[model samples]
Target chain A: KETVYISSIALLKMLKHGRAGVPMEVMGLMLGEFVDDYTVNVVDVFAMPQSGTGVSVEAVDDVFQAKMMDMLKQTGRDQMVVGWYHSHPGFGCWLSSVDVNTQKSFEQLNSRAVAVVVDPIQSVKGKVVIDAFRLIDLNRHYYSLNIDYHKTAKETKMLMNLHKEQ
Target chain B: SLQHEKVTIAPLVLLSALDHYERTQTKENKRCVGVILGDANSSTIRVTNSFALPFEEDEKNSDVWFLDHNYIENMNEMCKKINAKEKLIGWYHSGPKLRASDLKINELFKKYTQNNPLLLIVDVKQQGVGLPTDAYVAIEQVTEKTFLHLPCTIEAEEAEEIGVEHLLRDVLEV
Candidate 1:
């Protein structure tokens, strides 16, 4: 038995945009366009919009989250819970205790999949410094990222040179 | 096995449609219905029309009821694909209406009804006020034959028209 995985670049892109505080519908649509050529488009995503400040555990309703996850699972497509993104209006861009707990449970349930934490306001090196972490109990993979604005062109050029060299 | 000369279920292109006559009166209209139609031959059942059923407000009841005209013809072609009769199959609908639930159920119904001459209905409804919670799914039996009983709603009108186009195109496929 083998576990398939998502590439780091795709994960980075999802984290940056998922937590951009865009509406969930808009996020799903954006992800769709983002990965149309990639392996997977986000089959779906769930959002819990808050008004005043920090996101509370109560804000992440169990039933709603379960239903959202269920929707993806029912598709029976090669879909896994890539991760989740919510806003931190003032509390800053760190994974709250509840988020870690949620991530742990998500990892426990979807062993081969991963989760994400996002903060729309934070930026690194002129771009969003979105942090991503993957968990499978004892194996939690982490990364700090500044998305590649020039990667598309850079990759195209690299591929062109490879063609010439060959 | 009383296989009629053309009594096989057609190779239906299972498509989804949404019905908009919601009893709960929520602003959400992410409902869907499915109709399987095929072309019939003495041996192979060649089905072709698997288009999404769009919703409207003025189609007749029979138009949305069972096997509408285009669906029937669609079933006929599907039956022709497998040398069997294009018998009307089944349908399913959704309940406990919400965005995720509605979409999930609709996709599920579409998968099951694929390439089979079965009619499916994905119905959604909200149970309580302010408690946007608790929904259910009602699976209904459907035939590939048209239901000429009730008046049409807008939901069935557009779907029926598309069904006609689908049926017409089935000839090109076979």
Candidate 2:
């Protein structure tokens, strides 16, 4: 009965970043809290730069990573970086060996850390093709969880204006 | 002629329109219409947002509806507060298909825009082949004005992508 609850705000940011990268994949950092050992509430996300070729995500020089965390610190984001997300674009929405490696790294740090994948190209069918996964010890053996999009009364009023700012 | 050449709609626009339509549609009240907001460049009009307005069709003439003029602008004013650049681009309708009323509504939106405001027709009922929206821009065909079919593609900004992917979980999954 594990689940990941993501805010409309966080999900939208991931979709935007995923689309912006297009056929070339992109990765983003997730910020949120664990409602419990079994529930993750993702409240926000921010884009991380990607390598231009050959990988969904790649290492950046030290300054970029250093500067990015510094920017997040200075920009006043107080949430925990709970997970990592990426796009497969025309590819698919599962983890490759490299992708699994990245997710494995995150889980080692937080135990219940999650990895999110979005298929920007397949989502063209009016479906936001996405997956939320928490890894087990089984290598590629991962537990897929349902995502609940969060919104309420006032949020409807807010999207209407969106029907009209960002 | 369209002032903007390309029509790029964000993922949030259709979802917002669809959500608005269902949230408001009553058994007797079948109509769903609303205002669209976006920013413009020299060539393309990027429609990134939308919301529902309370509208009632004219009891007699389908062309003349009792549209909420005040709430329309009221919404626009508030949106301007968030991002002053995002302006009213046009209006939208939940037409399982097009309507005779769409002509008049598009005309009304023209005043809010620059003599030509795009019309977005969302097919909220049937599951279409892909995205369920069509875009329109006005053109003069004789003494008559016609709303021409404008090409549209789904696009999104950084934040909007999250909102749409988030919103889809409800409809697409549940």
Candidate 3:
């Protein structure tokens, strides 16, 4: 599934190994600097590129794969891979067919990977479903992500109080 | 007697995952089960779970784990594999032994039947048991829960006239 997190360790490892500059760093820089200019927000357009859904999802880069495994060794954890998220200029915060395909891919690879989408333009009340999240289990059961979302300068505020039954 | 005890469980909560982040941060499906002793009025549903261990590792606890969906679906799925009934009685979880913390799992007991009292089987390994003396402690913490400071011993390798499993299975189709 698509993986996302806010960690210097992730960024550092990505840069040292990810050859073509840090893709996530580029994403962060672009998203953070959107107030000054929206041109660099390629991922927003790349989410569903017409030519060829440009950005990759549901799969992790080899460098990230190695880095995550190494980090797990240090953290002493057998972590599950949560799915990815990309900005939608005005699109609703829901999974697209491409997103669904990404989710399916992760299900095959890791049994479960939750898919999330962020829509800056469509966000109501300057808030978004940034923190409260959910995940689908193997038996088609869904679970809620109770972690509090931290909105950096890039993100405004929480849009809603999310809850999942059963 | 078995059907009477089944009434205590809460109804299933039906809803989909809210957003992606909230989904991974919590746990679900794993339920609780139990049995009570003493007279009819005094008996309680001692909550317990008879499920198999999952191959996947749990971040909260290393030894604590769970298998895939097929591994814990029902009585037949789990019973045939482990030779035990997968009875759902109580929902449980762990915390640092320094404090007595019932997990965020709330409301399941509110809807439970009078026959079944949701048992709180706690795991206390890190240190001495914490404050709450009433929470149902497991065999591990039975001593801490009450303190007469009595010594005990058990004699082994004796066959009983009848096995409880056989008798129960014969009466109930399970």
Candidate 2 segments whose C-alpha is farther than 4 A from its true place: A1-147, A150-166, B1-3, B26-29, B58-60, B162-174
**lDDT tens per residue, model 3, B1-174:** 222221111000000101111222323422222221111132333321221112334456544433333322332232233222223443333222212222212223223223232333322111323211123322224334321111111111111001111112222362
TM-score of chain A of each: 0.43, 0.84, 0.41
Model 1: per-residue Cα lDDT over A1-166, one tens digit each:
1222222223333343343344331122111112322123333233443324344434555654454444323222224445454544334455556667655655565443333344444433224433444442255443332222212222222112111232
What DockQ does each listed candidate score? 0.01, 0.08, 0.01
Interface RMSD, every prediction, one decimal place: 23.2, 11.9, 27.3
Give the Cα lDDT of each candidate. Answer: 0.32, 0.68, 0.27
Q: Write the per-residue lDDT of candidate 3 for residues A1-166, one digit (tens) a residue.
A: 2223322112211121111122221111111111121111111100111113243452334443444334323322333343444444554455556655655665576443444444434333323323212345327343334222222211111111011010
**TM-scores of all predicted structures:** 0.30, 0.51, 0.25
Query: Which docking category, incorrect, acceptable, medium or high, applies to candidate 1?
Result: incorrect
Most TM-score-accurate candidate: 2
**Residue-wise C-alpha lDDT for candidate 2, range A2-105, written one tens digit per residue:** 88887765666567657757767877778778889778988766666555554433542345445445443432335687888888988778888888878877
Q: Sorted by lDDT, highest first, which candidate order results?
A: 2, 1, 3
State the lDDT of candidate 1 residue by residue for B58-88, as single tens digits: 1233223222344434433433432233333
Q: Candidate 2 at B155: error in angstroms? A: 1.3
lDDT digits (tens) for residues B1-174 of candidate 2: 435677787766665565565545433336577888876544677887765676777657776677867767765655564345668888888776677777777777777885368788876663465556688877778788777776777776644644554464354454
The single-chain TM-score for chain B of candidate 2 is: 0.83
